[PDB]
Point group: C3
Chain length 228, copies 3
Amino acid sequence: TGRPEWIWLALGTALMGLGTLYFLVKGMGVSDPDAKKFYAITTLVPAIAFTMYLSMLLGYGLTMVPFGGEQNPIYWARYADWLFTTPLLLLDLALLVDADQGTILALVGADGIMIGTGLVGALTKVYSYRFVWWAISTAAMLYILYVLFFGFTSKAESMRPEVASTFKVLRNVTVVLWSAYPVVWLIGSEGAGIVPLNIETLLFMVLDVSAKVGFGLILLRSRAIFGE
Amino acid sequence: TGRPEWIWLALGTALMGLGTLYFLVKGMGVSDPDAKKFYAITTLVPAIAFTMYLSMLLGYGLTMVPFGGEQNPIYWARYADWLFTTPLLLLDLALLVDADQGTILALVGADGIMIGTGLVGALTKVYSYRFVWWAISTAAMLYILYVLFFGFTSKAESMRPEVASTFKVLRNVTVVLWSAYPVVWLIGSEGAGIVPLNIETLLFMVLDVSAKVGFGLILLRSRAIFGE
Amino acid sequence: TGRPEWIWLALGTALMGLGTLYFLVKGMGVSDPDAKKFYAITTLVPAIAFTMYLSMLLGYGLTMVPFGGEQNPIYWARYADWLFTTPLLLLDLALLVDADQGTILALVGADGIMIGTGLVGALTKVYSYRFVWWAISTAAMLYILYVLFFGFTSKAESMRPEVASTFKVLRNVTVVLWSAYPVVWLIGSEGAGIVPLNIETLLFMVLDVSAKVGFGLILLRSRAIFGE
Ligand SMILES: CC(C)CCC[C@@H](C)CCC[C@@H](C)CCC[C@@H](C)CCOC[C@@H](COP(=O)([O-])OC[C@H](O)COP(=O)([O-])O)OCC[C@H](C)CCC[C@H](C)CCC[C@H](C)CCCC(C)C
Ligand SMILES: CC(C)CCC[C@@H](C)CCC[C@@H](C)CCC[C@@H](C)CCOC[C@@H](COP(=O)([O-])OC[C@H](O)COP(=O)([O-])O)OCC[C@H](C)CCC[C@H](C)CCC[C@H](C)CCCC(C)C
Ligand SMILES: CC(C)CCC[C@@H](C)CCC[C@@H](C)CCC[C@@H](C)CCOC[C@@H](COP(=O)([O-])OC[C@H](O)COP(=O)([O-])O)OCC[C@H](C)CCC[C@H](C)CCC[C@H](C)CCCC(C)C
Ligand SMILES: CC(C)CCC[C@@H](C)CCC[C@@H](C)CCC[C@@H](C)CCOC[C@@H](COP(=O)(O)O)OCC[C@H](C)CCC[C@H](C)CCC[C@H](C)CCCC(C)C
Ligand SMILES: CC(C)CCC[C@@H](C)CCC[C@@H](C)CCC[C@@H](C)CCOC[C@@H](CO)OCC[C@H](C)CCC[C@H](C)CCC[C@H](C)CCCC(C)C
Ligand SMILES: CC(C)CCC[C@@H](C)CCC[C@@H](C)CCC[C@@H](C)CCOC[C@@H](CO)OCC[C@H](C)CCC[C@H](C)CCC[C@H](C)CCCC(C)C
Ligand SMILES: CC(C)CCC[C@@H](C)CCC[C@@H](C)CCC[C@@H](C)CCOC[C@@H](CO)OCC[C@H](C)CCC[C@H](C)CCC[C@H](C)CCCC(C)C
Ligand SMILES: CCCCCCCCS[C@@H]1O[C@H](CO)[C@@H](O)[C@H](O)[C@H]1O
Ligand SMILES: CCCCCCCCS[C@@H]1O[C@H](CO)[C@@H](O)[C@H](O)[C@H]1O
Ligand SMILES: CCCCCCCCS[C@@H]1O[C@H](CO)[C@@H](O)[C@H](O)[C@H]1O
């Protein structure tokens, strides 16, 4: 069913909307052309998350998928949200470290595959097949995290200390936060229903707010976004 | 029902196809690398609109959405059309004024949110919820128009007189034309059915032709597209 | 029905996965910033094709479309695959010849129209209307092939012999391979069912493997990807 978890959806909606408003206000007085790019990328993340959480709260972002001999509530809007927000987050990191175009395309492509296959897995009717998609999606995520942890760090070391240190924090946060998603998916009602949809939703909400507002706070409050 | 308004859909389809053919022919003899970008962006707009209007005329682009205790005809293809055409129009304006990358991303993102939420609103089954989406979409549009009217104009003033004057005309046309969409939506069968689907369709057709052919005519017939 | 052709879907899935793994391994030791872009673009093509063929094999990528007085199996995942892979292939060619941004946008836009209308045609319930979409899609393809054969070749001649010769081979392969798709569509169960779904699927599989692995082999094994 899709009703008890409504509270986490409303809180999520509220936190994304507030985070968006905050980034918007904070970015009005900025003139630095570089920081300006960071504000545009980072402000869009929670703006999108706001619309997606609201769709889940209202019901539009919820669908029913049969599997395991039953109709299961699946929040497809979670994926529509991630489809656009994760590439943006990747872009933030890429700009901070001045990543090559080829590597950015590789990451965005891997990221689209990660979310796309995750969504296919969420809407798959054959229970067993859902885990095949989960595995492929997780493999794509690991590829991304690998490149971000090893490739970008080396790139970050060529920057001034402020950029390098802020990237390190965002990098660590990213590896931990992102890795948590496939685990929650696996234990929740979408994979092995070890935890109820109610707790599943709360966990994804905490993760999303941390990734779509927390990440942005750390970045936009640092001096690293200023090119100088 | 979806039959009486067929005439506006056929006229729309014909006007978009002709506008596409015209821009195509007109752009063949162009060598200026800058003008060339304007032709590619501007010619794609009605080409896309052509396929979308044709889908609406044939029926593919029409769906039924229950709300208000009835099954209502909703032309989702109108939105699929706008999803790709509005960002292109924004790109035309951006190139004309040499807008920063961060501002272009902000606009395109706001634009995707505008159309995306508008579509969610059009497919929402709870009558009352439809207006919440309309409001969010309108807020995103106002953000875009604000940046285009104030931000781009200042940017346009740094260009030669021909570019500045052509931008001013396109700017004024854009603010007036775009603002008309949420009003038509609000009075039509998608919001408060004050006007029938028949007139609703005709109004959107006039607006679309003006925006996807009229805008292009003003731009491609001006010398502003030449960088020199 | 969607069962006998399963073998071509499994072979396709296997070949795309292997081609992806091969490109991945082959690209690990590359440092040339230019070649690196080619590897990212080219490796993503079969990675995407892998997920799409797997969805068709598992059943997710298969839908039923009524027309001709019957429910017909339609592999929509074929189109979802092409939607992302063809623009990438176009990008490979564009980078090899250093095509202008306006021409790249024109091609990608024409390409999205080509696949999008092809998909609309595949999901159209009115038999006769399916061919209208096929014609529009084919017209867009011809536009693309025209620009690739005449426009890019001239651009390729300004490059060193290795780039020019490799482009010529990729160009010829592209014109022949791509042109084959609308023909297979036309003779298969999606258009005039002259050939059964079983052979239709096998033919598209041979074409896809040739285009998503064969094309990449020719490119990534050449010295043309090195800018120097
Ligand atoms: C069933 C399977 C067949 C299907 C697979 C599932 C699949 C869907 C999931 C995988 C995701 C996949 C789609 C991703 C596509 C990636 C592709 C586009 C990549 C193209 O490649 C782009 C480069 C970017 O490199 P750069 O950053 O520009 O480096 C520059 C220079 O080296 C300096 O670096 P410095 O800063 O550190 O000093 O990838 C980075 C280069 C790295 C240096 C090398 C990385 C190597 C990889 C981590 C190992 C790859 C795995 C192996 C082939 C085998 C394992 C298979 C697994 C299925 C068990
Ligand atoms: C319920 C709500 C929480 C949810 C909100 C609904 C939401 C879905 C709709 C809003 C759309 C939103 C998604 C848009 C995202 C925008 C974000 C990406 C922007 C990032 O920011 C990008 C910059 C681009 O700036 P620049 O052009 O490069 O300027 C350079 C220099 O200043 C010279 O300029 P010159 O040429 O004129 O001289 O935005 C331009 C900077 C401008 C100068 C300043 C603009 C300020 C705004 C107009 C005011 C913003 C509104 C306020 C926060 C509060 C109102 C809230 C409303 C809900 C009532
Ligand atoms: C029912 C109909 C109304 C609907 C139509 C169906 C439609 C959906 C299918 C068509 C696809 C359409 C959407 C494509 C949009 C294209 C548009 C964005 C193009 C904008 O234009 C971009 C340019 C790119 O040019 P460049 O490469 O940068 O060249 C630079 C310089 O010239 C040096 O060149 P060098 O290297 O060779 O030396 O297009 C290349 C310029 C070329 C040089 C000139 C090409 C001309 C065309 C081949 C002819 C166009 C056709 C005619 C208008 C009429 C036929 C209509 C048909 C329906 C029968
Ligand atoms: C939807 C589809 C239908 C619409 C397609 C659009 C198309 C009709 C218009 C194409 C227009 C452009 C060529 C515009 C003119 C450009 C001018 C500079 C003139 C040059 O035109 C020469 C070449 C292109 O070379 P360049 O552009 O690099 O120079 O045309 C290439 C000419 C080629 C060689 C001929 C065209 C071949 C057609 C496909 C076959 C026609 C049938 C023949 C009668 C059969 C011949 C076979 C015999 C051997 C049995
Ligand atoms: C240059 C680079 C930036 C490009 C990198 C390519 C990278 C984006 C690709 C990841 C690809 C893919 C593995 C993920 C897509 C799977 C998706 C088709 C499945 C959706 O499920 C559709 C079902 C649901 O009932 O209906 C079936 C209904 C219809 C018959 C299906 C029609 C589907 C269309 C093809 C739309 C697909 C939507 C994509 C998810 C949007 C990607 C946006 C991107 C720009 C971030
Ligand atoms: C770098 C920048 C250019 C990026 C900027 C990000 C900006 C594009 C985002 C706007 C985001 C969003 C608010 C709008 C999307 C809402 C959409 C999910 C709702 C569609 O409704 C789907 C329902 C209909 O029955 O079915 C449910 C069916 C399936 C279960 C749903 C699967 C949906 C997929 C996630 C596809 C979404 C399609 C997008 C509309 C395409 C955007 C293209 C863009 C490149 C212009
Ligand atoms: C700068 C440049 C790169 C941009 C160039 C623009 C170029 C991409 C556009 C080609 C446009 C168009 C002709 C093709 C789209 C047709 C598509 C809407 C039809 C899908 O059919 C949807 C039906 C199926 O049951 O459901 C109806 C269900 C819902 C009510 C429909 C909501 C649909 C959304 C609008 C999503 C459309 C998905 C696109 C196919 C994705 C394009 C990705 C691109 C980045 C490669
Ligand atoms: C007597 C046996 C009756 C079996 C009926 C089952 C038809 C199942 S289709 C199934 O749909 C999912 C969601 O679309 C895809 O994820 C799967 O891959 C695909 O296989
Ligand atoms: C006795 C009461 C029975 C109520 C049944 C109503 C289920 C309504 S779902 C509804 O679907 C729309 C379109 O998907 C979304 O836009 C809305 O937000 C969502 O709420
Ligand atoms: C007595 C006559 C009853 C006729 C019922 C037919 C309704 C057909 S809708 C049809 O759906 C397709 C797929 O969506 C679109 O491709 C077509 O363009 C559109 O026309």
